[PDB]
Amino acid sequence: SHMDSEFRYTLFPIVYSIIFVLGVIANGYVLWVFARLYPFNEIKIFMVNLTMADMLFLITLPLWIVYYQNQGNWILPKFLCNVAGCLFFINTYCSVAFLGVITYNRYQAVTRPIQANTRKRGISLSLVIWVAIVGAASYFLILDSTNTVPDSAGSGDVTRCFEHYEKGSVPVLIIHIFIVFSFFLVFLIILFCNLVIIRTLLMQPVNIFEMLRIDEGGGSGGDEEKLFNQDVDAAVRGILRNAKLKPVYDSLDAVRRAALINMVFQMGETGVAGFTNSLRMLQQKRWDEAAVNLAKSRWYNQTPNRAKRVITTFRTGTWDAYAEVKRRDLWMACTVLAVFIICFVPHHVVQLPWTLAELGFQDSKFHQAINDAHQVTLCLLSTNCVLNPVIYCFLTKKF
């Protein structure tokens, strides 16, 4: 029949049954959460496009349950197997692509925090990804999906679906090598991006460099905070060279000096020098009065979250304002990494040795072990339709 055969005919009918029911509930409810949202916009498109990918897979699951309940016999017409295989490839790589693009969006939102045609970009990208993956998945519709073999007992035959690999196929090896190398290349980008977001939003600023990294941004993680030190020193040099800003600056403590520096990085010496009254309240250590007067500016209307953070730093002289910043993003980063390492990485680790075993290039004792592993990763990869809807909690839930 097959190497891993024994348990696969029991595994998939149970595993895929749970997944079918949970995944149809989770993605169906997610289309209720999406519908009830008319007031993030770009991320919303990727999420809805990701659900569209899940629906395509979920609908094929009844066919796999029956195929495995029939001891691996594809009794329906051949093209329904072509379509089933095709939609599996679509689900997997649209999910890899849409999780990838959600990660990049959030990375740019944290790393570079600076039109309503952002929606036009989410739609533009989603289409590129669909054309790229549906185009690649189309090859599954031109293949001979099934192979007929004599049954072990009786007078019958067994019709396998996308299990047959012509012994020693070279295109198969090149295609499977490309996909795995392209996957871990994509996985490395995702891992780096989500670890930057996490690193940035976990590690609470204790200086002006870390403080301006949250509010203004800064690419990757380097120590050679030394280049940015130069920009701050040049900013302080000018502040002290300004008769309107020097008395206040000199009078302030190091944490409050950073808040003034922050303001200067945002609106410049010119901008900050036009806060005569608020600056006088600071020079006189009238923290609450200064804080209240600072909230009565256009700065507060224009950038409220940064203003609130800087005003708090002026009021308290502590870094508490930067303790739990952008938690929607911090949790998004963890969730995308969970969905990636759980669902996609196991399958992609097991993929190249299993293809080599299935092209015969590996021994019978290993071929049997890697086949068993393969059935487990194929189940892990299917949990994606139940797991990936969790990301919607970024849109709904507040911290």
Ligand X SMILES: CCCCCCCC/C=C\CCCCCCCC(=O)OC[C@H](O)CO
Which among 3-11, 65-73, 293-301, 388-396 is the span making contact with Zn ion, rule CB under 5 A? 3-11
The residue within the footprint of a second copy, chosen from 25, 188, 227, 234 (CB under 8 A), is: 188
With CB under 5 to 8 Å by kind, the binding choice for 130 among a second copy, ligand X, Zn ion, none is ligand X
The answer to whether the beta carbons of residues 378 and 347 sit under 8 Å apart is yes
265 marked as binding residue: yes
Of 3 and 97, which has the nearer Cβ to Zn ion? 3
Residue count, binding to ligand X (CB under 6 A): 38
Q: Which residue blocks in the chain are alpha helix, DSSP H? A: 5-35, 41-69, 79-111, 119-137, 170-202, 208-215, 227-240, 246-251, 254-272, 276-283, 287-294, 298-302, 304-316, 327-339, 345-357, 364-380, 384-387
User: How far, CA to CA in Å, does 264 sit from each of 101, 154, 215?
Assistant: 33, 84, 12
Distance CA(283)–CA(252), nearest Å, equals 7
- Smallest separation (angstroms) from a second copy to the CB of 298: 34
- Smallest separation (angstroms) from ligand X to the CB of 163: 11
Closest Cα partner for 200 from 188, 187, 210?
210
Of 163 and 372, which has the nearer Cβ to ligand 9EU? 163
Closest Cα partner for 100 from 188, 164, 18?
188
By the rule CB under 8 A, 117 interacts with a second copy: no
By the rule CB under 8 A, 324 interacts with a second copy: no
**What DSSP assignment string belongs to 190-211?**
HHHHHHHHHHHHHS---SHHHH
By the rule CB under 6 A, 86 interacts with ligand X: yes
With CB under 5 to 8 Å by kind, the binding choice for 3 among a second copy, Zn ion, ligand 9EU, none is Zn ion
CB atoms within 10 A of CB 331: 18
By the rule CB under 6 A, 20 interacts with ligand 9EU: no
The residue within the footprint of a second copy, chosen from 363, 393, 396, 397 (CB under 8 A), is: 363
Closest Cα partner for 381 from 93, 168, 155, 145?
93
By the rule CB under 6 A, 172 interacts with ligand 9EU: yes
Question: Whats the size of the chain, residue-wise?
Answer: 399
By the rule CB under 6 A, 128 interacts with ligand X: yes
Distance CA(219)–CA(232), nearest Å, equals 17
Residues 126-165 contacting ligand 9EU, CB under 6 A: 161-163, 165
Distance CA(126)–CA(132), nearest Å, equals 10
By the rule CB under 8 A, 128 interacts with a second copy: no
State the DSSP H helix or E strand holding residue 326, giving kind and residue range, or none if neither: none
- Smallest separation (angstroms) from a second copy to the CB of 102: 17
Residue from 163, 216, 225, 289 carrying the catalytic annotation: 216
With CB under 5 to 8 Å by kind, the binding choice for 31 among a second copy, ligand X, Zn ion, none is none
Residue with tokens 């094929």: 60
DSSP single-letter state for residue 297: S
Give the residue numbers annotated as catalytic, written as ranges: 216
Q: Which residues bind ligand X (CB under 6 A)?
A: 45, 48-49, 52, 56, 83, 86, 90, 93, 96-97, 123, 126-136, 139, 142-144, 165-166, 169, 171-172, 175, 178-179, 182-183, 186
Q: Which residues bind ligand 9EU (CB under 6 A)?
A: 12, 64, 85, 88-89, 92, 161-163, 165, 172, 175, 179, 378
